[PDB]
Amino acid sequence: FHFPLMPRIFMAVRRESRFPISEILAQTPPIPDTAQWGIFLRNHDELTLEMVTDEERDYMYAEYAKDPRMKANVGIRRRLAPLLENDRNQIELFTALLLSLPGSPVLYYGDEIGMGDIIWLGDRDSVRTPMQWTPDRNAGFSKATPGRLYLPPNQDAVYGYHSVNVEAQLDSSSSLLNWTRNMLAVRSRHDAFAVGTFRELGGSNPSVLAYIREVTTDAVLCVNNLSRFPQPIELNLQQWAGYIPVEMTGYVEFPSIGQLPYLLTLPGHGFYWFQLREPD
Amino acid sequence: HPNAEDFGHARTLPTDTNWFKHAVFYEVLVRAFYDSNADGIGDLRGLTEKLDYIKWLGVDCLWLPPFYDSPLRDGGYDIRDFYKVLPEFGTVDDFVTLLDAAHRRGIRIITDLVMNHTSDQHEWFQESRHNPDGPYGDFYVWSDTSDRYPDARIIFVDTEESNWTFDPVRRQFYWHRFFSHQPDLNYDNPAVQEAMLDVLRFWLDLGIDGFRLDAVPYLFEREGTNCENLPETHAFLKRCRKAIDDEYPGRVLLAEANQWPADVVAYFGDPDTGGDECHMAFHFPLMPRIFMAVRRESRFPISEILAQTPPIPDTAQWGIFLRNHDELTLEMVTDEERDYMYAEYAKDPRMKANVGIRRRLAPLLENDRNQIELFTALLLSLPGSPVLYYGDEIGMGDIIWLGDRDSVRTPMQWTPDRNAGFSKATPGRLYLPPNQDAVYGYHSVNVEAQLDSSSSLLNWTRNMLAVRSRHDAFAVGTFRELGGSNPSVLAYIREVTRQQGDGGAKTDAVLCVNNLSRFPQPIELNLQQWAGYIPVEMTGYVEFPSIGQLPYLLTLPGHGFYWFQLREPDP
Amino acid sequence: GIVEHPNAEDFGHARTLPTDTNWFKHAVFYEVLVRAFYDSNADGIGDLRGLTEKLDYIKWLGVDCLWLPPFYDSPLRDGGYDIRDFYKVLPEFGTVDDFVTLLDAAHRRGIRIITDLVMNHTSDQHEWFQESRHNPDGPYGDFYVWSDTSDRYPDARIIFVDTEESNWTFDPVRRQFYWHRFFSHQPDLNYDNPAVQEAMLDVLRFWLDLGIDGFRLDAVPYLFEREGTNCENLPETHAFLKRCRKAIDDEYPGRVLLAEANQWPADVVAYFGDPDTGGDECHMAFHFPLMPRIFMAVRRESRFPISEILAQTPPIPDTAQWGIFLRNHDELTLEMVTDEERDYMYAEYAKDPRMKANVGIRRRLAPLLENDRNQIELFTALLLSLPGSPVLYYGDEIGMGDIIWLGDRDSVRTPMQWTPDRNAGFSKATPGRLYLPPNQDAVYGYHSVNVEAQLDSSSSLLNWTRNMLAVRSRHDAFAVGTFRELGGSNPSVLAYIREVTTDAVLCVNNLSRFPQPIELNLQQWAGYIPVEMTGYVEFPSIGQLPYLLTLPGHGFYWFQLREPD
Ligand SMILES: [Ca+2]
Ligand SMILES: [Ca+2]
């Protein structure tokens, strides 16, 4: 497991700068041919409840403790939704990065519907409440009386089982469950995400992280905006001159790539996934 | 009845005859906003206490629906006494206290004022029926048979069987366009015209900033016509304007006319004089078109009504809000001939569900935050002065079962405390119950909760008004639609000219790009006219690449939008 | 030409229960709205087929007869009390066939069904009235009361004096005035026309052929109109009712006719008919001012407001039976019965803060008593032990609340709260589609008040209420026994004895919120052993000296007086 990815991605969105992500990706040594990295969106190891850090090799070493958000959850497992203060746009961005970055991703149960946690149950139990299936008694987890449950379901106004459950989200295709489902459906349609090369494109704007996955049989382009404000980025895609970028979630063709820098504009914490398609 | 110099005036704001063109209106019910006397009913003094919030939100003018003494059989649009505020809201003095307190922080106040009809409990009508040969015998339209004006339609065709109702005391029929307990005033009587002009003058003397004249198309009745928009009706409105211009410069007259744009343009008055009737009228079919435009993911239903709207006088200004029905009649405006979307609406499942019911912005868009932002973004950037409805800033919902108009008149949700922080009274005493469902409930949707994170809808909405107030282009600038190759993206430019010289956020050109599709969309715009200019995104002050000769490419996410300031290149 | 209407033969007749002409005297009625109980077609509106599915619950609760408010095709401008078609069930509830399916399913488990049937007026959308206005010289021109002026019957009052300015409204098509006691869209039927009398008797016969067990004839005091009178309770009105009874007794023995007459007890006794024949009009009428008196009696902590109306109620015929329920207002007019002369509590009610708050609004039992469980039990205990056949209102068994803001009559017509699941387990439809929203407040909300929750602990109000009906059904004394008030020295304690010639039962009720002792005189049952019914516990035998019983605040006891061996 590539453990410090999430803490870096987290701090990268905090700073609205791409470089804390870029750095660990650049400083990661190459691995064997059979080998594959494992990545997930958490800050602590479930065994020791320790966040990985190296006093010498981590340049963000002192930085974390100084951040108020990071400081609050030291030693406690938290879910994705609470970690990002239930910001839907962020939840999407972090998920989008998890699925498009190199290595095999691990989803944690209940994060697909944006469940929360109960920190007071324990530093590791916090994320081990019952799966919230319906807004029925015990969140549809058990028929037993509420007292018998191994852990109580979430009952607050925000992440409560009355408002956050699978049954509720199954219907509208705009729900986080259905959104998350479809993103996995897109990822499974391009091998580039799984086992393709990874070349970071850079760009003039420090708030936008753009990179290309490639298999020798798609080339895919991912542009992620770490800033909460709308950002423009001028990318250099001369190598794919003549190619037509096609946005994957809508199968929409964008203007063909030329010699001049390609301009893309993203909203706050937005992202795009383009399939680079050959000219005819 | 009382006099004005028996209550003392409120403070007068500096005289400005264009404030209404720059203002952002906030429609707030007195009964709904805040209760300070623990009676369970929102009151003037409570609304006074919460003016600091209103100021903080950044709205310029309050619009109060009718708060006059009334039996409230028709939501207070049936006025019993024009010179008396309904007991439960307070005294006339309490209204002056509100005015003065609001003016002190530059906030203006206008009010709904029904012109066509009074309640059957109004002293006038009781004198007309009891003393037919008295001085009020001709204040209302009486008849011996209900044959007169047969071309006029029954507005509420499901409740009223006729526009003539038989009074048992006077033994005669009386005319009423609305409900049988809301008799029409006889505007052919000169005394009636003078009486209503004195009603206007009363509140104007107290120092009110303007009115919204309700039900004005139905004032005069003439044979051989549908008794709507008759010349004599307009002629009376011209007197009201003259009375404003002559006696109280810098006040406003809004016209509630629920008709197609091509018809309501007549209510601004003779265009040769630059307007001599109302200052504002409402562009009613904008929202239904914007709504259907997002449904189709096509810009054209918006483009069409904007193209088909006739030009208005120089003084005049359109009023726009994000609702599908007129609060008076609960009817959605439509013209069988001139609306090409006529048959289309009934066929849409979403539109069909809410026919005849007022709904808030959040439920109308199924609580989709991205959409709520888009519709708000269009409201603030499209031509005309916008009206926000209270509680929409925090994305409150509605309770449809309370009534077709009461649905949107629940208490303002201030905190997650008992009664949503609206009143101290026991929950049973409340005039209407607060929202309690899992989605729009006061436990999850309230001002207190949203004040903290700058990501909240309240804070987002607040800042959008802050940006809009920094560029005049939005308020009173020109409107040129840019078109584009992609049908799903509506792009346009607002522009204000360099009056005697300057290069600030005053004399701006601004660019708005809106994506009506739920999927990400690219648009290639032609901005050659601003070659060399630098687009600067307003919410972040970020400079984008300078505009060139080639088409400019912008990419938006689903239901996204951008607001660019077009800034000059450096000499 | 003429109004078509279908026939009884064209549908299946439901199963018929063994003929019994006293069932209504022993029954416990359960008033349940079809729209409110259960929705099976996910339209958001409770329907006949849904109500059929939930009959097992009704059976389990232990009620004997369902009472359904009007479910006929209607524009629903007055809660369905404005009937548009007597031979058609409102589309959203189902077809007439679906009603037969309910009947047969209910009869199979011994449950009877009665229904509200408005007699005085039809909707202005009814085919008859449309034919009367359009074809004045046709066969329906005299089906409604027409006039050239609004001058006739000036002694008659306007029932809804705040909504209607006159009892005559001008029709534009016919160019004439038409009479209506109620709203302007509910024209009065002309009962002087013999054809009208026959038409309405055929309406009765239709549903009776289908196999319905009875009716509640609504608004019957206003049928006939005569000059020089207030057009209420006229002799010809009663004369027509006598025909309805004869038609029942001759064609369908063992059916019932309830009279909704919202008047003082001394007046409604006339609706049972000539007492010489032992009754020849209605079998049941409602004793309307019982609840307001019981209510004020608990307020004062004095037994006498109850004692007084029980003493001042005139005797009724042998067939006859009183109907009693725990509500302060008549669902038709939303008026609380009172007589300025004969009610001594006349001025008293308006002065009470609690009574004053709910004037004109239907409220449930639980909110009426501020959710006080001990009171809810006391009032229920009185309802089941006092003379006459009791009517339970749906949802009161689990102590549901109301939503007053929905309307003065809709307040008590929210959906039945089955589970704490979405829509309280009433429907699968999206919450917006529901005909009325379920209760959502912290007290009476469906998260905290529902059937599923209460089924488990035998201490719940549902289970308590169920068992009280189970005890009542084990002693005939409660249903059809004599009623002798025992009095006592303590004014706060109401004690009385029901007797059949085969139990004697003793009921002691404490109206005070504090514990109270009462010394009763039960010398007549000397040697007898009182046995408390809910626990089968033997108390000390009754002697010559006064018997002392001590009750807690708002407590009560039910003793079976058992013979010595
Ligand atoms: Ca008029
Ligand atoms: Ca009648």
CATH code of the domain containing C489? 2.60.40.1180
Do residue A137 and residue C422 have CB atoms under 8 angstroms apart? Answer: no
Checking C537-542 for CB contacts under 8 A at 24+ apart, the result is none
Checking A104-108 for CB contacts under 8 A at 24+ apart, the result is A104/A36, A104/A37, A104/A38, A104/A39, A104/A194, A105/A38, A105/A39, A105/A40, A106/A38, A106/A39, A106/A40, A107/A40, A108/A40, A108/A41, A108/A42, A108/A79, A108/A80
- CA atoms in the 13 A half-sphere facing the CB of B431: 25
Query: What strands, in cross-sheet order, belong to the sheet with C176-179?
Result: C146-147, C176-179, C168-171
Residue B87 sits in a domain of what CATH number?
3.20.20.80
- CA atoms in the 13 A half-sphere facing the CB of B550: 9
Do the Cβ atoms of C241 and C282 come closer than 8 Å? Answer: yes
With vertex at residue C123, the alpha carbon angle to CA C121 and CA C124, rounded to the nearest 5 degrees, is 110
Cα B504 to Cα B411, B471, B472, B565: the distances in Å are 42, 9, 10, 11
Please name which of C117, C175, C113, C179 lies closest in space to residue C143, comparing C-alpha atoms: C179
Domain end point (choices C167, C190, C213): C190
Secondary element (H or E) of residue C103: helix C96-108
Residue C171 sits in a domain of what CATH number?
3.90.400.10
φ and ψ at A6, to 5 degrees?
Answer: -60, -50
Check if B214 is active-site. yes
Size of interface A-C (CB pairs under 8 A): 13
Spatial distance between the Cα atoms of B245 and B273, rounded to a whole number of angstroms:
13
Task: Return the residue matching tokens 């902590």.
Answer: C301
What the block records as the tokens of B351 is 């539109």
- CA atoms in the 13 A half-sphere facing the CB of C98: 20
Residue C101 burial class via C-beta count within 10 angstroms: exposed 0-12, middle 13-18, buried 19 and up? middle
**CA torsion C306→C312→C318→C324, rounded to 10°?**
-30
Q: What residues flank ion ligand 1 with Cβ within 5 A?
A: B 116, 184
Do the Cβ atoms of C417 and C446 come closer than 8 Å? Answer: yes
| Mutation for B interface: A237, A253, A265, most B CBs within 10 A | A265
Say which residues have a Cβ less than 8 Å from residue B91's Cβ, sequence separation at least 6: B85
Do the Cβ atoms of C418 and C425 come closer than 8 Å? Answer: yes
3-state DSSP call for residue C257? strand
φ and ψ at B303, to 5 degrees?
Answer: -50, -40
Do the Cβ atoms of C504 and C529 come closer than 8 Å? Answer: no
3-state DSSP call for residue A184? helix
Checking B265-269 for CB contacts under 8 A at 24+ apart, the result is B265/B310, B265/B312, B266/B229, B266/B234, B267/B216, B267/B234, B267/B237, B268/B312, B268/B313, B268/B315, B268/B316, B269/B234, B269/B237, B269/B238, B269/B241, B269/B313
φ and ψ at B297, to 5 degrees?
Answer: 60, 40
Spatial distance between the Cα atoms of B395 and B367, rounded to a whole number of angstroms:
8
Spatial distance between the Cα atoms of A83 and A11, rounded to a whole number of angstroms:
12
What does the longest C-alpha to C-alpha distance in chain B come to?
A: 82
Spatial distance between the Cα atoms of A104 and B296, rounded to a whole number of angstroms:
39
Do residue B540 and residue A227 have CB atoms under 8 angstroms apart? Answer: yes
Domain end point (choices B476, B497, B524): B476
What the block records as the tokens of C491 is 């004014």
At residue C398, what is the residue type? I
Strands B280-282 and B317-321: parallel
Spatial distance between the Cα atoms of A231 and A264, rounded to a whole number of angstroms:
9
Same domain, C98 and C126: no
Spatial distance between the Cα atoms of C494 and C504, rounded to a whole number of angstroms:
17
Number of residues assigned to chain C: 565
What the block records as the tokens of C15 is 């199963």
- Domain of C138? 121-190
CA of A251 to the centre of ligand 2 (A): 70
B342 interfacial to chain C (CB closer than 8 Å)? no
Same domain, B219 and B298: yes
3-state DSSP call for residue B288? helix
Domain count, chain B: 3
Same domain, B196 and B145: no
Look up residue C188 and give its DSSP letter. Answer: B
Same domain, C427 and C514: no
Spatial distance between the Cα atoms of C482 and C106, rounded to a whole number of angstroms:
31
Cα B534 to Cα A148, A232, B493, B514, B552: the distances in Å are 65, 13, 14, 19, 12
Instruction: Give A250→chain B minimum CA distance, Å.
Output: 6
CA of C222 to the centre of ligand 2 (A): 5
Annotated binding residue at C121?
yes
Q: Left (φ > 0), alpha (ψ -120 to 50) or beta: where does B18 sit?
A: alpha
Name the structure determination technique: X-ray
**Residue of B366, B438, B522 lying closest to A254 (CB–CB):** B522
Please name which of B163, B182, B282 lies closest in space to residue B228, comparing C-alpha atoms: B163
Helices vs. strands in chain B: H and E counts, helices first: 18, 21
Task: Return the residue matching tokens 């002409």.
Answer: C21
Do the Cβ atoms of B104 and B64 come closer than 8 Å? Answer: no
Domain end point (choices B453, B476, B499): B476
Number of residues assigned to chain B: 571
What the block records as the tokens of C500 is 């059949």
Strand intervals (E) in A85-230: 104-106, 197-202, 208-214, 219-225
Same domain, B18 and B143: no
Strands B489-495 and B280-282: unpaired
**CA torsion C92→C95→C96→C98, rounded to 10°?**
-100
Cα C478 to Cα B63, C14, C290, C530: the distances in Å are 63, 31, 17, 16
Same domain, C476 and C505: no
What the block records as the tokens of C348 is 């008293």
3-state DSSP call for residue C191? coil
Same domain, C296 and C353: yes
Residue C527 burial class via C-beta count within 10 angstroms: exposed 0-12, middle 13-18, buried 19 and up? exposed
Spatial distance between the Cα atoms of C386 and C469, rounded to a whole number of angstroms:
13
Strands A244-247 and A252-253: antiparallel
Q: What is the 3-state secondary structure (H, E, C) of B200-249?
A: HHHHHHHCCCEEEEECHHHCCCCCCCCCCCCHHHHHHHHHHHHHHHHHCC
Q: Which chain C positions have a beta carbon within 8 Å of A139's beta carbon?
A: none
| Mutation for A interface: C422, C446, C452, most A CBs within 10 A | C422
What the block records as the tokens of C138 is 């046709």
CA dihedral sign of residues B111, B112, B116, B120 = negative
Say which residues have a Cβ less than 8 Å from residue C379's Cβ, sequence separation at least 6: C294, C298, C326, C365, C369
Please name which of C170, C168, C167, C165 lies closest in space to residue C133, comparing C-alpha atoms: C170
Spatial distance between the Cα atoms of B503 and B220, rounded to a whole number of angstroms:
50
Q: Left (φ > 0), alpha (ψ -120 to 50) or beta: where does B330 sit?
A: left
Same domain, B229 and B211: yes
Instruction: Give A265→chain B minimum CA distance, Å.
Output: 5
Q: Which chain B positions have a beta carbon within 8 Å of A263's beta carbon?
A: 545, 553
Same domain, B522 and B546: yes
Say which residues have a Cβ less than 8 Å from residue C557's Cβ, sequence separation at least 6: C506, C507, C508, C532, C549, C551
Say which residues have a Cβ less than 8 Å from residue C194's Cβ, sequence separation at least 6: none
Same domain, C49 and C178: no
Same domain, C106 and C173: no
Same domain, B272 and B414: yes
With vertex at residue B474, the alpha carbon angle to CA B470 and CA B475, rounded to the nearest 5 degrees, is 90
Say which residues have a Cβ less than 8 Å from residue B500's Cβ, sequence separation at least 6: none
Task: Return the residue matching tokens 């398609």.
Answer: A277
φ and ψ at C66, to 5 degrees?
Answer: -85, 140
Spatial distance between the Cα atoms of A259 and A249, rounded to a whole number of angstroms:
26
Spatial distance between the Cα atoms of B276 and B237, rounded to a whole number of angstroms:
8
φ and ψ at C477, to 5 degrees?
Answer: -50, -45
Instruction: Give B421→chain A minimum CA distance, Å.
Output: 17
Annotated binding residue at C81?
no
Helices C290-300 and C304-311: angle between axes, nearest 10 degrees = 150
Label residues B304-337 b or e (16+ Cβ within 10 Å = b). ebbeebeebbebbbbbbbbbbbbbbbeebbbeee
Spatial distance between the Cα atoms of B421 and B434, rounded to a whole number of angstroms:
10
Residue C452 burial class via C-beta count within 10 angstroms: exposed 0-12, middle 13-18, buried 19 and up? middle
